[PDB]
Amino acid sequence: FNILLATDSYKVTHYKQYPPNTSKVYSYFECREKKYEETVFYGLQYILNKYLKGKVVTKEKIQEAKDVYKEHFQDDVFNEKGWNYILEKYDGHLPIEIKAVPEGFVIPRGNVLFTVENTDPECYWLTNWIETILVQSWYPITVATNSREQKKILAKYLLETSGNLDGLEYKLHDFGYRGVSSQETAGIGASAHLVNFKGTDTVAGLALIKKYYGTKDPVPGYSVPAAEHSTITAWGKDHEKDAFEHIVTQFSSVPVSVVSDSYDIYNACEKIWGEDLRHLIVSRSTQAPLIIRPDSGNPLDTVLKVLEILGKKFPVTENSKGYKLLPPYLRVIQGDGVDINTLQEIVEGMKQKMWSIENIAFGSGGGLLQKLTRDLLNCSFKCSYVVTNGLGINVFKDPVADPNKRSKKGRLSLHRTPAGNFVTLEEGKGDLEEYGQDLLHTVFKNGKVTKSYSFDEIRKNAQLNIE
């Protein structure tokens, strides 16, 4: 990795495009206004540690970038002078300052999340150079926000159907690994799901948390053994009971997820699980239940189908709220077609049918880690303040064509008003400190991470509240 080759190409030429005596370029990030009314600020620390901290510039990288740009542009348009200056004066450390709201904070749309500026007047071009790498925090932010929004649905419906929040943290399992664009995307997205939940299959998220954030607990995410069509079918139709028995006996002390639709769902439930192997299931611990995956079809219909047939063979009870509840050794997982919308439908549909949410857990692949863009929360990075010839300019973009909410102006700060509202103060109005302390803190300054947060602090900052 070489930071000198980690930017949009056109930004390499920017050191030649500014008015002379430009000493300061100040830029900020927000999730612009105009269902996701608030965002979970997560992911910056990862970027800061992995790509920006310490000696990121060397003689080798300078010459490597010089050679690539020469061919790529078919012209000498690379700042060897400016980059050699960072190497000589700062030992390749970036003379930049990043200030940001604490990770895991829940912030309404249209508020500053983080700001960037150069610290040395000579490195005015550096602010826009690192824009590309920083804007990429749109992804862990979007992943964390959507994952938190799904947790709200689950919390509301588990409280409405049971009066408790039992296993809430395990009700949305991450299955996204194979559905994402890369190994790095997987790790980042999985770490972002884990901000709100404790169940993943994207092992990549565990090593990411341990390396860049840390938890007091031995792991940030958990999983259970599971049996798919590929393993069941290798046994053959006449050995489905033998398959089921082998799997459940191997995983006696922990929960086990087993597919029911390989041959015949009704027979797997009613006859195999409900008759032949019933002695092995009824014996199971509340901590180690058998989890059944439904047949393919409508996510609500298949869930409803499974619940009803299991209820014909196993003792179903009415909880404190009057909702149908399966025995503790038996649970259901819906891992087909789950996104923020279908989740709301399955849980509403279950309530209507007097079935508790205590019974069900969900799985999400592409709809949790891939079918997401910078467009969802309107993640924007704009320059708001420039110092040319000692003269400060409150820069912005207010186009008449797309009005939107438009770019903010000048130096920025985030505050929580006495009334508990988040406010972003423009044109340096925050320097008045009328609205309390600035919520943004210096996380990065001149090649050093100055402020860090453990994943536990993040989790705690991201907590659901009974307001």
Ligand X SMILES: O=C(Nc1ccc(CN2C(=O)c3ccccc3C2=O)cc1)[C@H]1C[C@@H]1c1cccnc1
Q: Which of residues 96-135 bind ligand X (CB under 6 A)?
A: none
- The Cβ-side half-sphere exposure at 79, using a 13 Å CA radius, reads 23
Q: Which of 361, 372, 386, 458 binds ligand X (CB under 6 A)?
A: 361
Residue 335 binding target from ligand X, its own copies, none, CB below 5 to 8 Å by type: ligand X
Helix axes 340-352, 138-162, angle to 10 degrees: 0
The Cα-based distances of 102 to 45, 70, 457, 466 in angstroms read: 10, 41, 9, 21
Q: Which of 170, 235, 314, 396 binds ligand X (CB under 6 A)?
A: 170
4 contributes a contact to ligand X by CB under 6 A: no
The Cα-based distances of 285 to 255, 309, 331 in angstroms read: 9, 22, 12
Do the bridges between strand 96-100 and strand 112-118 make them parallel or antiparallel, or are there none, so unpaired?
antiparallel
Please list every residue from 434 through 463 that binds ligand X, using CB under 6 A.
none
The Cα-based distances of 245 to 228, 274, 280, 311, 439 in angstroms read: 14, 13, 8, 21, 56
Span from 37-45, 218-226, 245-253, 340-348 in contact with ligand X (CB under 6 A): 218-226
Nearer of residues 362 and 453 to ligand X, judged by Cβ: 362
294 contributes a contact to ligand X by CB under 6 A: no
Residue with tokens 């989740």: 343
256-259, strands of its sheet edge to edge? 172-174, 360-364, 330-334, 290-293, 256-259, 226-227
In whole angstroms, how close is the CB of 373 to ligand X at the nearest point?
15
Nearer of residues 316 and 443 to ligand X, judged by Cβ: 316
Residue 386 burial (CB count, 10 A): 21
In whole angstroms, how close is the CB of 170 to ligand X at the nearest point?
4
Nearer of residues 184 and 228 to ligand X, judged by Cβ: 228
199 contributes a contact to ligand X by CB under 6 A: yes
333 contributes a contact to ligand X by CB under 6 A: yes
Assigned token pair, 129: 């150079």
Strand partners, 115: 28, 99
In one-letter notation, the amino acid at residue 462 is A
331 contributes a contact to ligand X by CB under 6 A: yes
Span from 52-60, 221-229, 311-319, 446-454 in contact with ligand X (CB under 6 A): 221-229
Please list every residue from 211 through 270 that binds its own copies, using CB under 8 A.
218-219, 221-231, 233-236, 239, 242-243, 246-247, 250-251, 253-254, 257, 261-262
Q: Give the span between the Cα atoms of 342 and 267, in whole angstroms.
A: 27
> Can you give the binding site for ligand X, defined by CB under 6 A?
8, 10, 170, 173, 175, 199, 201, 223-224, 226, 228, 255, 257, 289, 291, 293, 331, 333, 335, 361, 363
